[PDB]
Amino acid sequence: KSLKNRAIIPRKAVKKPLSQLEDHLDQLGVDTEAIGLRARAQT
Amino acid sequence: VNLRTQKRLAASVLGCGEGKVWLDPNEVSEISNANSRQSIRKLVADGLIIKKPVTMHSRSRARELNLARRIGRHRGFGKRKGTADARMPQQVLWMRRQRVLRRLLVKYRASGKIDKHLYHELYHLAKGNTFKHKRALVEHIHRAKAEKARERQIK
Amino acid sequence: KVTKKFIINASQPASDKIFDVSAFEKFLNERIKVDGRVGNLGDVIKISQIGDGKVEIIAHNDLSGRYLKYLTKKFLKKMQLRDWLRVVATSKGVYELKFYNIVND
Amino acid sequence: PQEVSDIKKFIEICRRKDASSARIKKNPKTQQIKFKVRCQRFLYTLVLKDSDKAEKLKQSLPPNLQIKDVPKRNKR
Amino acid sequence: RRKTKAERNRIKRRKEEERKRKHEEAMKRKQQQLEQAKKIAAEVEERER
RNA sequence: GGAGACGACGGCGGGGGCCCCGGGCAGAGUUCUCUUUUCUUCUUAACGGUCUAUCACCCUGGAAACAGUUUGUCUGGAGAUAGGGUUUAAUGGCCGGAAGAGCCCGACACUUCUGUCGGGUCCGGUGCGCUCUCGACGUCCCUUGAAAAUCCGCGGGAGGGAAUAAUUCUCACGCCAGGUCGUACUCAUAACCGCAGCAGGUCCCCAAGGUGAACAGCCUCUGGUUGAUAGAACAAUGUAGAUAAGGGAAGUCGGCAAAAUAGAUCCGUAACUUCGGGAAAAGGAUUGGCUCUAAGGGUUGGGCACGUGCGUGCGGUUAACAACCAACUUAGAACUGGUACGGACAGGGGGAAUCUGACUGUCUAAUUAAAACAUAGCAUUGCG
RNA sequence: GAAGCCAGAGGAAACUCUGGUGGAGGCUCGCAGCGGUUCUGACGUGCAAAUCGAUCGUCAAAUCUGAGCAUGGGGGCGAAA
């Protein structure tokens, strides 16, 4: 956060990395291989 | 690679300032290949150029301060800086009071609570600063009607 | 008496077992406030599950879909899914939860 | 732009020799339909309620005058 | 006698209601001409001939 | 004959825009905790139609027990009040323009070419607010505050005019035409002048939020910049900003400089005076926060008998009552922190006298701003 | 806070007193603007052949200012230095 000087870019305007999403869900304890995030990933 | 022209064109297309234009730092070559407003619009549709949102300016503290000044806080002699007439004009107060009194007198004369002679003398007393407010005028009218009723009963 | 029907769709993250529909039900039941006080639902607002990872809300008061989206985003922030799940209105009174756009690196 | 409140006056306006074209604008939220005929000086608009008689008025309009239905998007 | 605010308000409301009734009658007349459009077109064509 | 066509200043009222508050749809941000949260979009042109808008004018009628009436005392037997109408004036409401636009959001497609399709774009309030415009008043003058091009109305009745029909109709629609030159950009701490990309100078329009009396100072939004050689160290002497025990002008030609005073509410205020002033004289008391109390407003609405929502003939001034709505001031009281309470910023030191010029004003651009000059007042001379 | 105006208390009246209203003045504090008082000021081959800072005067007018035009050296203009 730097809300004094600038606004935060909306989350929908930045494409999320599949590696970071998989890492976060794997830390949360979700079997990513059983759900197939690669198919949902765009290119 | 220089992107000043692309930033200016993106600002003109998005209808914002040049400080609100965000150019993708990872696809600089494709942004530099855009030399026309059609290409800039195509990159905006692709999401490579976006308009940054406005910086925060909230009115929340002003609204809480307005509520505090409404319920009566921060009105003390340490808070007052202008003179009493500068804060609230006696001319505006007199205008409000005279309009209230004349409106009430017109309403009473229309409804028939008073006649035109009582209306005229009460009008000139209101102009001559006899009544402080509507309650004072109403009490004076009630006392005058009571005295007239007593005189009629005596006669 | 007017009745408003709201659907919070979480079918896809419920199928991924990412979003806990029962925990979201409990969170809504303990955080939806009526007349400025939490735990004051009574018969005014009812929360149920219609299945397939969907939450169904019946409101006889002036409950707002903006308020429901606000509480859904609060629940996502609690469950550390605010950076990864998005609440999007798809119909009149229907808010679905979906992943943000994903790039393959 | 002028609004015509008389069906007879609109018929004579459409049968005038200067009438280049006419168009149909349907507003379903307002439940209304607009007949707009283009002449040399003025664009004349007749406002009616959405009804089968309003749709039938197209048949009583002159066949020589071209009539078009306005699409949802004014594509440039 | 001098009229009061109640009389003035009723005068204002009657004038507004009269305007509303005139507008409603105008819409009804336009509607009736809309069902009688074909005879109107026949009369216009006959006058032109 | 009207228009073109006209000063400065003051308060009041209407309208547009901006600012502010509330609800709703959508989007975004915050989320240890709290926050039904905070912010963003929610717009409507020219040109027209239609219904209304202060002044004023018209009709009835004849006013003292004078009345109407503005914040501001003007109006009325040269006809007021009242009742009923006619009109100058829209940047007012509705409709056409025009949602088909613009804006916001979403779902697919997309090597490019390119996009495609949905959902909306809504409902209110407030004001000694800022700004522009309009209107009625008012004040000042030994000052009385342009002209012309051009356009219109009227007086007048010369002519021209009908039933082979006539029409020289400022009505509606229709037909035709509208040449020449300028148009980029800067308008300034780099586009002009100063020899220069020079801290100088150079005429205007639009002007957000908070504090506050305030287009003061300080902080923020939109929009702009982040440009004015850099790096390291922290000696003297400087320049700029501060503090200092005790004493308090002992310093010095000379309190030079600096310090002290300062906003607001209340108490109170001398000599002198041309009676207007002096005067913010002097000298004192107080000022935060929190929880309350009190006062100061707007809108709507009266019973019968008939004819049938109005017309009458009545009857009454406890509506002194109910319902709804709304904002900023003022006074009072308790509690409470304290070394500070106009906590930064902002912001008179005061007094006793003398000389001097009546005052406001003006000049020595680039060493002198003054008892100099001017000023109103007074007196003299010349001119029919 | 000047005329003008309203109400009340007196006074035979003319006038006197009290509370308001009103908004005059080549009035006054003071932002901009215009000007230029003082500092052992800065600067002194300067940013500048007159600049910078603080302080000061005035601020509804004998105020400030643009463009067009007029006055030309035996001259003009001059609230006169």
Curated annotation (Swiss-Prot), chain A:
Disulfide bond entries: none
Localization terms from the record: Nucleus, Nucleolus
Family (UniProt): Belongs to the TRAFAC class OBG-HflX-like GTPase superfamily. OBG GTPase family. NOG subfamily.
Function per UniProt: Involved in the biogenesis of the 60S ribosomal subunit.
Protein known as: Nucleolar GTP-binding protein 1
Organism: Chaetomium thermophilum (strain DSM 1495 / CBS 144.50 / IMI 039719) (Thermochaetoides thermophila)
Gene that specifies this protein: NOG1
Location of this fragment in the whole protein: 510 to 552 of 661
